[PDB]
C-alpha cells in the first residue's frame, strides 16, 4: 500500500524512547535512594514524540517532580493538568501520591493527555502508540486518557483509583 512515508506517526507508529521505560519506572514505588531529593530526580512527566513526531518522548516542557507537589503544587493533580495544554497530546507518568484502601501508595498513572483540539496526528498516533509505550509501560499503574484536562480530574482519578478501592482522592480529599 502507501507505506512510502515512514513517518511512523501518520498511522500511529512511534517507537517510544526508552526514557519511557524509565518514566513508568521514575514513579514506580519507593524507588528513591533518599526521596528527600529523589522527587527532584524528576519522575512526573509528559512525553510527546521525538523529533518529527514518533518515539514516545519527553519533549515539550512539562513533567512534575513528585516532591514539588506541595510548593507550586499541593498533592492534588490539576497542576500537572496545567502541564497538559490543548495544543499537544502525549503519554505522561506522574508519580501519583495518593492513599487508598491500601493507603498512601504512590502509584503514577499513564496519561493519554489528548485534547479534542490537538492535531489529528497526536490523536491518531497514540491510538496505536499505546502499545509501543505499553511494551515499556508494563505496569502503567493507571492507563488514563484525558480528552479534556477534566478527565485527569482528581475526583475521576479518584475513580480510576476511587472507582476500584482507594481512600484518598476518592475518600479523604476527594
Amino acid at each position: 500500500t502507501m507505506i512510502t512515508p515512514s513517518s511512523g506517526n501518520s498511522a500511529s507508529g512511534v517507537q517510544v524512547a526508552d526514557e519511557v521505560c524509565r518514566i513508568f519506572y521514575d514513579m514506580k514505588v519507593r524507588k528513591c535512594s533518599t526521596p528527600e531529593e529523589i522527587k527532584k530526580r524528576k519522575k512526573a512527566v509528559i512525553f510527546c514524540l521525538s523529533a518529527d513526531k514518533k518515539c514516545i518522548i519527553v519533549e515539550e516542557g512539562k513533567e512534575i517532580l513528585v516532591g514539588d507537589v506541595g510548593v507550586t503544587i499541593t498533592d492534588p493533580f490539576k497542576h500537572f493538568v496545567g502541564m497538559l495544554p490543548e495544543k499537544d497530546c502525549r503519554y505522561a507518568l506522574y508519580d501519583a501520591s495518593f492513599e487508598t484502601k491500601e493507603s498512601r501508595k504512590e502509584e503514577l498513572m499513564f496519561f493519554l493527555w489528548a485534547p479534542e483540539l490537538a492535531p489529528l496526528k497526536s490523536k491518531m498516533i497514540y491510538a496505536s502508540s499505546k502499545d509501543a509505550i505499553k511494551k515499556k509501560f508494563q505496569g502503567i499503574k493507571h492507563e488514563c486518557q484525558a480528552n479534556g484536562p477534566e478527565d485527569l480530574n482528581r475526583a475521576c482519578i479518584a475513580e480510576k483509583l476511587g472507582g476500584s478501592l482507594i481512600v484518598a482522592f476518592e475518600g479523604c480529599p476527594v
Side-chain angles (χ1 to χ4, degrees), residues 61-72:
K62 328 248 69 153
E63 151 246 282
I64 248 175
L65 300 304
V66 339
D68 276 22
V69 175
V71 163
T72 303

Side-chain angles (χ1 to χ4, degrees), residues 6-16 53-55 124-126 128-129 132:
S6 57
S7 340
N9 66 272
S10 283
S12 41
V14 303
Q15 0 256 298
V16 5
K53 232 63 98 216
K54 276 196 198 137
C55 287
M124 313 255 246
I125 265 179
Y126 279 129
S128 215
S129 220

Side-chain angles (χ1 to χ4, degrees), residues 23-152:
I23 295 156
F24 118 103
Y25 139 80
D26 241 331
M27 29 273 299
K28 202 69 224 290
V29 57
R30 306 238 307 158
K31 257 152 196 149
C32 58
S33 226
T34 205
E36 280 225 299
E37 73 177 69
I38 256 48
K39 359 183 273 178
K40 225 134 239 247
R41 278 59 259 280
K42 175 204 125 210
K43 329 177 160 246
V45 280
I46 279 129
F47 1 121
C48 44
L49 316 201
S50 205
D52 222 44
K53 232 63 98 216
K54 276 196 198 137
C55 287
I56 222 88
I57 216 258
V58 161
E59 197 206 10
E60 98 81 71
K62 328 248 69 153
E63 151 246 282
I64 248 175
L65 300 304
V66 339
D68 276 22
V69 175
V71 163
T72 303
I73 12 201
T74 18
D75 210 354
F77 85 101
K78 49 114 48 120
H79 137 77
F80 150 100
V81 316
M83 310 191 288
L84 308 178
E86 323 174 278
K87 91 290 293 311
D88 261 327
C89 339
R90 40 238 334 152
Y91 283 165
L93 296 207
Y94 153 71
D95 207 350
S97 311
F98 66 100
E99 295 135 280
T100 156
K101 293 216 152 199
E102 335 216 288
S103 310
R104 188 77 146 282
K105 313 246 285 156
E106 209 179 50
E107 135 157 2
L108 54 105
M109 307 186 346
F110 212 12
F111 263 107
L112 306 352
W113 180 220
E116 283 182 287
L117 108 79
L120 293 102
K121 41 123 287 183
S122 174
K123 349 199 333 203
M124 313 255 246
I125 265 179
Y126 279 129
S128 215
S129 220
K130 243 153 94 232
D131 207 315
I133 172 140
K134 245 103 231 310
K135 280 224 238 200
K136 308 305 118 105
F137 264 28
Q138 318 294 248
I140 237 320
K141 321 316 288 169
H142 275 323
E143 136 163 15
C144 207
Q145 181 157 94
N147 306 173
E150 124 177 65
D151 255 84
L152 297 97

